[PDB]
Amino acid sequence: SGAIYVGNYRVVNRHLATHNDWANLVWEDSSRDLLVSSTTAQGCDTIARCDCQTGVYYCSSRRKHYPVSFSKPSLIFVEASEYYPARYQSHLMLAVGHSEPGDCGGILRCQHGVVGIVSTGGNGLVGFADVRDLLWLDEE
Numbered sequence: 001s002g003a004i005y006v007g008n009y010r011v012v013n014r015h016l017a018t019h020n021d022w023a024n025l026v027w028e029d030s031s032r033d034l035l036v037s038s039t040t041a042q043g044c045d046t047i048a049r050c051d052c053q054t055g056v057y058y059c060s061s062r063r064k065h066y067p068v069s070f071s072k073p074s075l076i077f078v079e080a081s082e083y084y085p086a087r088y089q090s091h092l093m094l095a096v097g098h099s100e101p102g103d104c105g106g107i108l109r110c111q112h113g114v115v116g117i118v119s120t121g122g123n124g125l126v127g128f129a130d131v132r133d134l135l136w137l138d139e140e
């Protein structure tokens with residue numbers, strides 16, 4: 001589990017969104033596994049606006065932050081899970097790293113800020129849903 005709190009927005013994995021998230025919905029996209037809801041309190045996270053391909057992510061199944069090299073956001077095939085059938089997920093970046101069911105939501109960050117959140121994994125891989133192209137998170 002995990003979320004990004006930027007301004008008056010909460011960014012979470014769409015497959016882990018709560019009823020309160022759906023009842024205060026700002027934007028959602030199943031193809032990216034992202035959902036954004038509105039919040040009453042202001043958040044402290046800042047979004048990265050860069051082209052970094054190295055950063056650090058939080059892995060809840062190890063209570064550790066790991067440095068990783070990750071691919072550019074692209075369309076990747078993801079195996080069937082209890083949340084989605086086997087399909088192509090867009091704006092996904094892959095890296096070599098530990099991930100397990102429960103690790104979704106952990107933040108990936110670079111020197112410029114938050115890059116994205118854990119969304120996929122398996123066999124020594126971890127995939128992150130990019131959020132750097134969502135410019136509207138920085139305003140309104």
Ligand SMILES: CC(C)Oc1ccccc1NC(=O)N1CCC[C@H](C(N)=O)C1
Nearest residue numbers: 033081099100101103104119120121122
């Ligand atoms: C990060 C962890 C949950 O990943 C795994 C780690 C080890 C084995 C499987 C997964 N599961 C996985 O890749 N998911 C399940 C949840 C929905 C994801 C999606 N965005 O389509 C796909």
Ligand SMILES: [Zn+2]
Nearest residue numbers: 050052110112
């Ligand atoms: Zn950066």
